Amino acid sequence: MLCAISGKVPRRPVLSPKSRTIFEKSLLEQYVKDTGNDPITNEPLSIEEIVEIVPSAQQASLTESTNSATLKANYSIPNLLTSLQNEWDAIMLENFKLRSTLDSLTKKLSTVMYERDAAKLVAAQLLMEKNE
């Protein structure tokens, strides 16, 4: 999560309840102390309403027992699944477009075959008239 003012990972994260957005505590508090407004919605906001997020000590202890393998694994099962879903969606669209194209191409091929045979007939007739 990134602070919406700084675009950096906050060192003391807070949630504005108005914008439902994470900010750096100092930045948000100072902005409110100057303007009295939420920096995204421009709604009135008070320092008491700001919900400071606590970085849980449990979060640290949970990133301990997640094996170094699983933190070095630049994969998450959610992200893997979503990638597989996006692939499936894309391949479904591709197969649809393939079918539609193949049908159009069959109809076109039939048309061109009729045109070829008509050209051959005109040519043969002109040749016959030239030899007589």
Add this chain to the structure above:
Amino acid sequence: MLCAISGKVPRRPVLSPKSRTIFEKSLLEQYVKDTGNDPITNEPLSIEEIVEIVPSAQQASLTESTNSATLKANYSIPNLLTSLQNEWDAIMLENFKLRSTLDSLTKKLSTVMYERDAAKLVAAQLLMEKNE
């Protein structure tokens, strides 16, 4: 009812108001965002014009209970993963068949088109030689 793109039972059914056809939400939204058109009629369609179909509570319970009751016999993660792989292989076989057929037809079409133009040319040349 099946999605007109995937041929599967949708999970978030939507109706195009142009084609009056049912699709999976994700597929139709992607196709519209790419082409700006309805995939069947090719009429221009926006994502806001899509009508999301609300499933009745009997439909929601049926989708959950069909999934549940039939996955229940093979609900182990290892069986899920094996089924996923087999389904991917099935899709990839279908895509390969489609692509192969399109390639073969395209080569044939190209041949026939060259034959048609060759015949038209020979006809025109015979007509010239007969009018001299």
Add this chain to the structure above:
Amino acid sequence: RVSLVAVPLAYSTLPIPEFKNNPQSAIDNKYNLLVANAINKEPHMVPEDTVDFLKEVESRMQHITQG
């Protein structure tokens, strides 16, 4: 001077077909010549008169294909 004009082969988006190994007719020779030109990327040059005879041949072909 006979002005030569390049006949635009409409098939630029399609893969060049193989040669006919036994060209039994003038049409098949013309086909092989078109294929050779496409392989070489050369335009197929024809006399300017031939383009008008091509238009007349196309008119006859239409009457045939309407059956």
